[PDB]
Motif scaffolding. Sequence first.
Motif, PDB file in Angstrom:
ATOM      1  N   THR A  69       0.822  -1.206   0.000  1.00 56.04           N
ATOM      2  CA  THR A  69       0.000   0.000   0.000  1.00 56.04           C
ATOM      3  C   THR A  69       0.858   1.258   0.000  1.00 56.04           C
ATOM      4  N   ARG A  76       5.664  -1.372  -6.099  1.00 52.03           N
ATOM      5  CA  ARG A  76       4.515  -1.479  -6.990  1.00 52.03           C
ATOM      6  C   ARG A  76       4.908  -1.479  -8.459  1.00 52.03           C
ATOM      7  N   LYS A  77       6.168  -1.190  -8.781  1.00 49.59           N
ATOM      8  CA  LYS A  77       6.632  -1.384 -10.147  1.00 49.59           C
ATOM      9  C   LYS A  77       6.474  -2.835 -10.580  1.00 49.59           C
TER      10      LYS A  77
ATOM     11  N   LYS D   1      -1.454  -1.728 -15.733  1.00 55.87           N
ATOM     12  CA  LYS D   1      -0.801  -0.476 -16.097  1.00 55.87           C
ATOM     13  C   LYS D   1      -0.090   0.141 -14.903  1.00 55.87           C
ATOM     14  N   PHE D   2       1.209   0.382 -15.050  1.00 55.95           N
ATOM     15  CA  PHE D   2       1.966   1.072 -14.014  1.00 55.95           C
ATOM     16  C   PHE D   2       1.630   2.557 -14.047  1.00 55.95           C
ATOM     17  N   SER D   5       1.086   6.563  -7.911  1.00 57.91           N
ATOM     18  CA  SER D   5       0.415   5.965  -6.767  1.00 57.91           C
ATOM     19  C   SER D   5       0.074   7.025  -5.731  1.00 57.91           C
ATOM     20  N   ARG D   6      -1.098   6.881  -5.117  1.00 57.61           N
ATOM     21  CA  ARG D   6      -1.551   7.754  -4.043  1.00 57.61           C
ATOM     22  C   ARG D   6      -1.518   6.962  -2.743  1.00 57.61           C
ATOM     23  N   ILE D   7      -0.667   7.383  -1.815  1.00 54.99           N
ATOM     24  CA  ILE D   7      -0.498   6.675  -0.549  1.00 54.99           C
ATOM     25  C   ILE D   7      -1.670   7.013   0.366  1.00 54.99           C
ATOM     26  N   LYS D  10      -2.972   7.456   6.251  1.00 57.35           N
ATOM     27  CA  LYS D  10      -2.623   6.860   7.537  1.00 57.35           C
ATOM     28  C   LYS D  10      -1.131   6.576   7.642  1.00 57.35           C
ATOM     29  N   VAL D  11      -0.454   6.388   6.508  1.00 53.38           N
ATOM     30  CA  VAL D  11       0.970   6.069   6.538  1.00 53.38           C
ATOM     31  C   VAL D  11       1.749   7.181   7.223  1.00 53.38           C
ATOM     32  N   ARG D  39      19.661   5.780  -4.012  1.00 51.16           N
ATOM     33  CA  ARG D  39      19.322   4.809  -5.037  1.00 51.16           C
ATOM     34  C   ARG D  39      19.304   5.523  -6.378  1.00 51.16           C
ATOM     35  N   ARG D  43      15.625   2.729 -14.256  1.00 57.10           N
ATOM     36  CA  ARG D  43      14.648   1.660 -14.085  1.00 57.10           C
ATOM     37  C   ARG D  43      13.473   2.130 -13.239  1.00 57.10           C
ATOM     38  N   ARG D  44      13.374   3.435 -12.965  1.00 55.77           N
ATOM     39  CA  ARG D  44      12.256   4.046 -12.266  1.00 55.77           C
ATOM     40  C   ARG D  44      11.451   4.901 -13.239  1.00 55.77           C
TER      41      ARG D  44
END
Lengths: 100, 100, 315, 46, 95, 52
Positions: A69, A76-77, D1-2, D5-7, D10-11, D39, D43-44
Motif C-alpha cells: 500500500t 509497486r513497479k 498499467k503502471f 500511486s496515491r499513498i 494513515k501512513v 538509489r 529503471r524508475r
Amino acid sequence: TPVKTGCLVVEMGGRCEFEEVKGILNQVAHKLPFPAKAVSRKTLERMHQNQRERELNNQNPWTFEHIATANMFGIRKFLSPYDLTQKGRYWGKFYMPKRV
Amino acid sequence: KHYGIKKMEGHYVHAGNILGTQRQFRWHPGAHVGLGRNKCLYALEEGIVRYTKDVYVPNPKNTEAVDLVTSLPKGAVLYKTFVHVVPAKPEGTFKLVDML
Amino acid sequence: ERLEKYRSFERYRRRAEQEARAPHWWRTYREHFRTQKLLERKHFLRELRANVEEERAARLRTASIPLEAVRAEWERTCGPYHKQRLAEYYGLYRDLFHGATFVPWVPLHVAYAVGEEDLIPVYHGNEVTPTEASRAPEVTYEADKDSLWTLLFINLDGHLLEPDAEYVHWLLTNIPSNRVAEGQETCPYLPPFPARGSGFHRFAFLLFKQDKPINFSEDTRPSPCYQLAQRTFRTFDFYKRHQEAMTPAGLAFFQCRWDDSVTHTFHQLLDMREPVFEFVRPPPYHPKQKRFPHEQPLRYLDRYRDSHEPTYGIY
Amino acid sequence: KFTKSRIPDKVFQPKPEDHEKYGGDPQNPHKLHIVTRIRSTKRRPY
Amino acid sequence: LTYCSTRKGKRKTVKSVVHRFLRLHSGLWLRRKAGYKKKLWKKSTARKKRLREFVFCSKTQSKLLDKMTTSFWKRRNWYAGDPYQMYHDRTNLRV
Amino acid sequence: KTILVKLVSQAGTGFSFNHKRSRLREKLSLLHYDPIVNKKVLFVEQKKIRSL
RNA sequence: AACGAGCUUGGUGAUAGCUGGUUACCCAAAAAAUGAAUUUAAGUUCAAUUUUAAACUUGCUAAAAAAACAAAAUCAAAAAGUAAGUUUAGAUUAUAGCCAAAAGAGGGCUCUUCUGGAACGGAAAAAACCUUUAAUAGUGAAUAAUUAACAAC
RNA sequence: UCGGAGAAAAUCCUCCGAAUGAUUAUAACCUAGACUUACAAGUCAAAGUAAAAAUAUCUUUGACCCAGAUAUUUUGAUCAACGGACCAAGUUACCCUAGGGAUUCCUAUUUAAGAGUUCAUAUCGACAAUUAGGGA
Ligand SMILES: [Mg+2]
Ligand SMILES: [Mg+2]
Ligand SMILES: [Mg+2]
Ligand SMILES: [Mg+2]
Ligand SMILES: [Mg+2]
Ligand SMILES: [Mg+2]
Ligand SMILES: [Mg+2]
Ligand SMILES: [Mg+2]
Ligand SMILES: [Mg+2]
Ligand SMILES: [Mg+2]
Ligand SMILES: [Mg+2]
Ligand SMILES: [Mg+2]
C-alpha cells in the motif's frame, strides 16, 4: 461452472457425525479438478479462527499489505493492481493459506 | 467526430467559440449560449463558461414533451444540464468626445 | 405510482418555478448570475357582497374600479414597502447611504408646474424633461403641526469630475411642518443639467425628520451659486454629521435626459462649454496575427489594418 | 498499467511509540530537511 | 523541375503553379477552393459561400510555391487600379 | 426517378437556379428571391438539366 | 564451344524504389520504427518529432474545490520546488524495432494501452532482469546489487 | 469508399444501410469568432444589410485537367482499384535479371462404482483426479 477459492461445492446434513461423512467427502473432493477438502461447521470455524489468530500474533514487523500500500521499496513497479486487494494471499488461481 | 467538450468550465471564451459538439442533447443551451443546426454549443458573449443543472420546461406547442412532463409524478420534476457563459466585460463606456 | 401525476401543463410550471427559487446543492443559473381593522374590513366586504348591483355588473362583466381611491389607500397600507423596492431597484439606498435602507413613510408629493393650467408630477422612476424642471417644484407632504423638516434634492450620477460625489440642486432647512416657504434656502434652485449622450440620470427627493432646529451654516451656499466645485456634495457624510437630528422619511425620484434647455444652463449661468459624451463599445477581439494566415479569406488582412488609404513609403 | 500511486494518509500519521523510537517531538517540528539520494532513478518511472 | 536549363542554364517556372495561385509581395499566396464549380445543386448554401472565397496558403505550401516559381513572379508590380493594391503589405505584424 | 430542372425568373431577368423535381409531377413553379430585382418573384421551369 | 532468338560497334556513363561500397582528428546535440495519403506497404510527400539561429515571456512538476462523466486521466485559482517555454527563419534523417512487467481484446501465440531497459558489477556463460549521474590519472577509502537454502507423533 | 450500432480508445471482431429520395411556407447576400484537419476536403455561427411578415422538415460521396448548356449562370463518373493513369487481357515446366527468404490414443501414478460363481485391487476396471510424461 466456475468456482472460486473458499466456495462450498456441495453441502451435506442429517443425523450423522462428521467422522461418518469424512471418508466419502474426502474421496469425492480428491477427484475434483481444483484442490478441495471436507470441512464440518467446527472445522471451517477453526480454520478462520487460526487465520485471524496468526495475523494478530505475527512477530514479523513487515507485512505484504503495508509494503504494497505504501509503495515501500518502489515495490509497486513489480506488482499488479489487484495485488493490493489480495495482500499476497492469492496468486493467480492458487490460494496460499500460510501467507498472512 | 471527436465529439466532446471543446471548452471546459472555468475557461475564458470569446464571442463565437464553440463549446461542445453532440450527436444527442448531452448538454443544453443556457444563457448567452446558442444552438447550431448540428446541435453544437457556441458562446454568444465573451465570458467564463459554466455548466449547471436546472429544471426543464418545454414549449407548450410540442405535444410529446408536454405529455411526458404532465405524466411525471406530482412529487418532483425532471432535470437537465445547461451551459452558461458569464459576460466578463461591460457593454460599453461613455467618453468625452467634444466640448462645445 | 403512489403519487398523482400532473394532469395539466400549468401545474408542472407552477411547481417548476417554485422549485427553481429554492436553493439546491447542485450548481444553478441563479448562483452565477389591527384586529379591529380586520373586523371592520370583513364587515365592509360583506356589505359589498350583499349589493346586488355589484353582482349584476360582475356577471355582466361591465364592472370597474376607481384607480385614485386605490392609489391613496395603497399609499397608507403598503406604499412604503413598494417604494422601498423601487429605491433598492434603482440603487438609491446603495449610492446614497452606502447600503443603509430606510422605508419611506411620509407620502411625499412633488410636481413641476407647467405654466398654470397643469403641473407635472414626480413619482418614483418618472420621466421629466429638463425644460419641465426649469423652475422649482411645489411640495406638499402632510407634515402635521411642528416636527421641523429638511428637504434635499440631488442628482446621484450627474457629477462630471468625481464619480462618487454628486451635485446639490436645492436644500431647504428648518422647514416647520407643512409650510415650505418658511425654510432657509441654503442652496438656491438650479435647473437640471444632464450632459448630452450621457444616458439617464436619476434625481431623488430626500426628506429628513428634524427633532430640534439646527443651523446648517456649513451647508449654506451663496445665492446664486454657479460653481460646480461648490455644488459637489456627499449625502452619506452629510447625514453622518446630522444623523442625531436627521432621519429620512420621504422619497421621490425621476429620470431625465439631455435637452435644449440644458444647453442654456451650461452657457448662460454655469458659464462653461457644455460637455458632450458618446457611448463607446470596446474594440472587437481579433486573435494575434499569423505571418501565414493559412486557410483564411482575403479579409484577414483588413481586420488588422488601421488606415484604409494606400501608402507608398520610399516611392 | 503502471501508474502514479496515491499513498493512504494513515501512513504519514505517526504513533506515540514512533516518537520515542526516532526521538522527535510532535510539537516544535524541525524546520529543514537533510535529503540524500541513495538509489538510482534508472529503471524508475519518468 | 528544371534547375539548370539546357539553353539558358537557369531555373524554370512550373506554369501549372502560375495558372492557379496569386503571390502577394509580402510572401503570401492566394488560391481558390477545390470543387467550387462542381455539383453546386447538391451543396448547402453555407458550403457554397465557403467555396467561393479566396484563401491563403500555409507556410509549407508557400515554401513549395516559392521553389516552383522564379524570381520574376516575386517582384513588385505597380498596376494602375490594382484591386490587390492594399494586400501586398503587412501591417501591425509583430512576430 | 428525379430530374434536375432549371427554374427561370419570370421578372424579365436572366436569373435562374436549379431545383429537383420528381418526373411524375407537373412542372415546378416557385416564388423565389431575385437578387437583380431585390424582390420575390415567380420562377418557372424552362429546361431539364439532367436526370438525378 | 550455353539462341524463347546470333555476334560486333554505336545509341550508352541505358535504367535499376534492388545488392555492394562510400578514404583524417576533436567537441556537442539526437530522434523512432507514431498519424495520414499513395498500383502504396523493399519507396516517397505531409504531419509529428529532432535540430540550428533569432525574437520575448513565462514554462515544467503539481494542481483545491467543479464541473463534464457514470452517480485516472481530461480541464488548471492560488502556492511551492524548480528553469525551462512560445513564436519567427532554415534543415535533413526517419516513417519494419527487440525483450521484461502490468491492463485488456481476439484464442501459447496476435493485436492495443501504460512503465522500464541496452555494465565495463551481479544473476555461471547472459542485448532486454538487478546494482550503476559523464569523462580522467593514483600500489588510497567507504559502499551497491550479489543462486542459493537449512523426515513425522 | 463512406455512414449507423455493440465490444468500450485494437480486431480477419458482430450487425444495418448509402451511393438516397420524400417533404415543402423556397431557405439571400455579406461577415466577428471557432470546430475538424498532414494536405485536400468537411462543419457551426453573432453582428450588419436585403427579401418577406417560421426555419426548409426529414438525417451521404469524387479532386484537377478536359469537354458541354446558356445568356452570365450552370451541368458532366459503380473515375466503386471510390486522392481518381484519357485509353491495355492470358500464359511460361523454354525462361532471364535484381534481390529477399527458407533449405486423440496410449504410458506412469491417485481414486474404486462395477467385472471376476463367492470376493474391489490374481487379472482387469466406469465417472473422475496428476504443474504427471508422450506420440469464408
Ligand atoms: Mg555461340
Ligand atoms: Mg546506376
Ligand atoms: Mg520499393
Ligand atoms: Mg491510383
Ligand atoms: Mg499555476
Ligand atoms: Mg554469490
Ligand atoms: Mg485545410
Ligand atoms: Mg442575424
Ligand atoms: Mg488505389
Ligand atoms: Mg485509394
Ligand atoms: Mg480519407
Ligand atoms: Mg514439358
